[PDB]
């Protein structure tokens, strides 16, 4: 009774571990959902649980391994690992219908997980400063 899954944003990697129980609450990358410090990320990382099925669906014991990004991209890395993590189960341990209900309710929500929304910083180039910004002219 398990699956496993991975979140990704930019470089940030979340990995969703999966264990089963119906009473339980999730740690942050290392620390429980409730207590993650920037409120304004929490209610986001609530969205995985709260939005769509809040309670009727998943209390499952879940831990996440998040490395490779700064703080916020690690909050987006996370939730995806959950929505991915959750959708994994109802394919393995449940019927298409219970799945089809959930992932639709995601699809309407946004690309909560359709994908990492792949965007990586542009390589700095030439004498160009940072990227696309040029060393500035004078006496032009």
């Amino acid at each position: 009774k398990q699956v496993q899954t991975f979140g990704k944003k930019k470089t940030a990697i979340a990995v969703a571990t999966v264990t089963k129980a119906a009473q339980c609450n999730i740690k942050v990358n290392g620390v429980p959902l409730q207590q993650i410090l920037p409120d304004t990320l929490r209610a986001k990382i609530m969205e995985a649980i709260t939005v769509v099925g809040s309670k009727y669906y998943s209390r499952l014991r879940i831990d996440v391994a998040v490395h490779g990004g700064g703080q916020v991209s690690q909050a987006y890395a996370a939730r995806q690992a959950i929505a991915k993590g959750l959708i994994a189960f109802f394919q393995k341990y449940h019927n298409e219908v219970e799945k089809a209900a959930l992932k639709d309710k995601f699809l309407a929500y946004d690309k909560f997980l359709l994908i990492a929304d792949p965007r990586r910083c542009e390589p700095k180039k030439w004498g160009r400063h940072s990227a696309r910004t040029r060393f500035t002219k004078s006496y032009r």
Partner: protein, 190 residues
């Protein structure tokens, strides 16, 4: 709905909302959201800007003039304080006030150079729906940095003070004063 569909700023009411003005009504964001900070490819395309909650749009448009700025998360803090001050000033859903504060802010009509090749010439030109959206939020929060620059005894209130007023239509708001003074440059020229 047991906090499933419905949304909360932290705990707040996004359902009863609509815009008043049939002009820009029915395209402006009517919120279902929690936090104004979301990340997606916000405007890949041409008119995509009208989808996402003004709450973002403000929080997004929230802090120009970057110097050591944290933007979205620093913004959302300020909007925790901003909305709360506002509703229990105005006794309304500040989701309404802000929604009601967008419309009265921007000029419905403008005067541009249509002059050809260095000639400065006039025409009355008629503003477009996304420009009352856009310029409102832009100038709306421009009143902040001004009212907020030095003389403040007022930490967040500046933002509260030009959202409150505009939602009242008052001419004191740096928001609306340009809605009229542009139209002294509009109906005058035409």
């Amino acid at each position: 709905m047991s906090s499933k569909t419905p949304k909360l700023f932290n705990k707040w009411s996004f359902e009863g909302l609509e815009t008043s003005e049939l002009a820009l009504r029915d395209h402006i964001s009517t919120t279902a959201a929690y936090v104004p900070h979301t990340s997606g490819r916000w405007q890949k395309r041409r008119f995509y800007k009208a989808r996402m909650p003004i709450v973002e749009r403000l929080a997004n448009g929230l802090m120009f003039k970057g110097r050591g700025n944290g933007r979205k998360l620093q913004a959302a803090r300020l909007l925790k304080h901003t909305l709360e001050i506002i509703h229990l000033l105005t006794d309304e859903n500040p989701l309404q006030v802000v929604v009601d504060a967008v419309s009265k802010g921007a000029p419905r009509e403008d005067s541009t150079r249509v002059g050809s090749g260095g000639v400065v010439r006039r025409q009355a030109v008629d503003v477009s729906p996304m420009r009352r959206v856009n310029e409102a939020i832009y100038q709306m929060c421009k009143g902040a940095r001004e009212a907020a620059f030095r003389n403040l005894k007022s930490m967040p209130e500046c933002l509260a003070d030009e959202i409150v007023n505009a939602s009242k239509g008052s001419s004191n708001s740096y928001a609306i004063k340009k809605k009229d003074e542009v139209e002294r440059v509009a109906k005058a020229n035409r």
